[PDB]
Amino acid sequence: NLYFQGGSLKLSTPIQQLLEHFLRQLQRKDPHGFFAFPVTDAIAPGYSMIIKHPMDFGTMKDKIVANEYKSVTEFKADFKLMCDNAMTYNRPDTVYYKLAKKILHAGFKMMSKERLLALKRSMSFMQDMDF
Amino acid sequence: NLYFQGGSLKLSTPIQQLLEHFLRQLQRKDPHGFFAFPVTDAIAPGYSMIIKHPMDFGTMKDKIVANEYKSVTEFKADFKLMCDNAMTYNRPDTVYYKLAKKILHAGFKMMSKERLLALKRSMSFMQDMDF
Numbered sequence: 243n244l245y246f247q248g249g250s251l252k253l254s255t256p257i258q259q260l261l262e263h264f265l266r267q268l269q270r271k272d273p274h275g276f277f278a279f280p281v282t283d284a285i286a287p288g289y290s291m292i293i294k295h296p297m298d299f300g301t302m303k304d305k306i307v308a309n310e311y312k313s314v315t316e317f318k319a320d321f322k323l324m325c326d327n328a329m330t331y332n333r334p335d336t337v338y339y340k341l342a343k344k345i346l347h348a349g350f351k352m353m354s355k356e357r358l359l360a361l362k363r364s365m366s367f368m369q370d371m372d373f
Numbered sequence: 374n375l376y377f378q379g380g381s382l383k384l385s386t387p388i389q390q391l392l393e394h395f396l397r398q399l400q401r402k403d404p405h406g407f408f409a410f411p412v413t414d415a416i417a418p419g420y421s422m423i424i425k426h427p428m429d430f431g432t433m434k435d436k437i438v439a440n441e442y443k444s445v446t447e448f449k450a451d452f453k454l455m456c457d458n459a460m461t462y463n464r465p466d467t468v469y470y471k472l473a474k475k476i477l478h479a480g481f482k483m484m485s486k487e488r489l490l491a492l493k494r495s496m497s498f499m500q501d502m503d504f
């Protein structure tokens with residue numbers, strides 16, 4: 243199943259472009275990859291018993307690639323689920339709890355509707371120009 | 374002469390926003406301010422005899438503030454006039470000649486219609502989003 247356009251044989255949406263950008267920036271807060279892959283029962287005994295809805299950055303990346311996010315709010319919800327899971331399974335004295343708390347706070351600030359509107363407004367002048 | 378809008382008493386165009394940005398970046402290539410002010414006959418004997426149409430970054434800033442640039446091409450022309458003046462009055466062995474040549478080449482690359490189109494296209498996804 244193909245189509246021909248602009249001299250190229252073919253077959254990335256705005257939301258995919260936005261979420262790919264924010265996911266790369268959030269994963270930079272986790273240089274050791276603690277949040278990069280699903281938590282296994284081997285590394286975290288009882289995890290599958292305690293945490294009913296697991297989430298990780300790698301699973302969110304798969305959702306972006308497959309174009310399964312319909313809103314920023316859905317992305318932020320998955321992000322929040324990951325951080326809440328880490329702050330439920332792990333004790334407050336752990337790197338996982340402390341990092342989840344920092345990531346959750348920083349991510350919600352960075353992706354607020356009000357902030358994205360202000361960034362869009364700052365960029366609008368380039369769309370008003372003809373080049 | 375005033376008007377009231379959005380609860381504020383009033384009275385910056387896309388081209389003004391674009392040119393203010395590029396002028397700041399071009400002046401960063403001239404940290405000593407050699408191109409920041411008109412060349413005087415005191416600092417450059419015979420300048421007013423040799424150079425018929427003087428130009429400097431400070432004069433270009435005044436034009437931006439006064440909203441006197443109708444195109445990027447007009448801005449690039451003033452920039453080119455400044456660099457050509459420096460490469461006419463000064464010998465090739467001078468910092469002024471060498472800097473003018475570097476500024477001229479870098480400025481034309483950075484402000485090419487093709488580059489600005491590509492930057493506009495990279496940014497378009499944010500204008501397609503609703504926040």
Ligand SMILES: COc1cc(OC)cc(-c2cc(C(C)=O)n3ccccc23)c1
Nearest residue numbers: 274275276277281285286328331332338
């Ligand atoms: C110490 O090295 C690692 C590596 C890792 O994947 C690269 C993931 C984790 C990890 C991540 C988590 C999480 C996120 O809960 N975790 C909980 C208990 C024990 C380990 C982990 C730790």
Ligand SMILES: COc1cc(OC)cc(-c2cc(C(C)=O)n3ccccc23)c1
Nearest residue numbers: 361364365366368394491492493495496
């Ligand atoms: C230096 O100030 C700015 C302002 C801006 O929009 C307001 C956007 C950028 C900007 C930054 C970037 C980067 C970092 O990729 N970029 C890529 C394509 C088009 C614009 C930009 C830089």
Ligand SMILES: COc1cc(OC)cc(-c2cc(C(C)=O)n3ccccc23)c1
Nearest residue numbers: 405406407408412416417459462463469
């Ligand atoms: C060496 O210090 C300075 C300072 C300056 O203004 C801050 C401007 C110039 C300067 C700038 C120029 C130019 C641009 O032609 N010039 C030519 C002959 C002698 C001096 C200069 C030199």
Ligand SMILES: COc1cc(OC)cc(-c2cc(C(C)=O)n3ccccc23)c1
Nearest residue numbers: 263360361362364365492495496497499
């Ligand atoms: C990290 O990659 C990017 C990409 C971008 O547009 C493609 C723009 C920016 C960007 C950079 C900036 C800066 C540096 O001011 N900026 C300001 C307002 C809105 C957007 C941006 C950064």
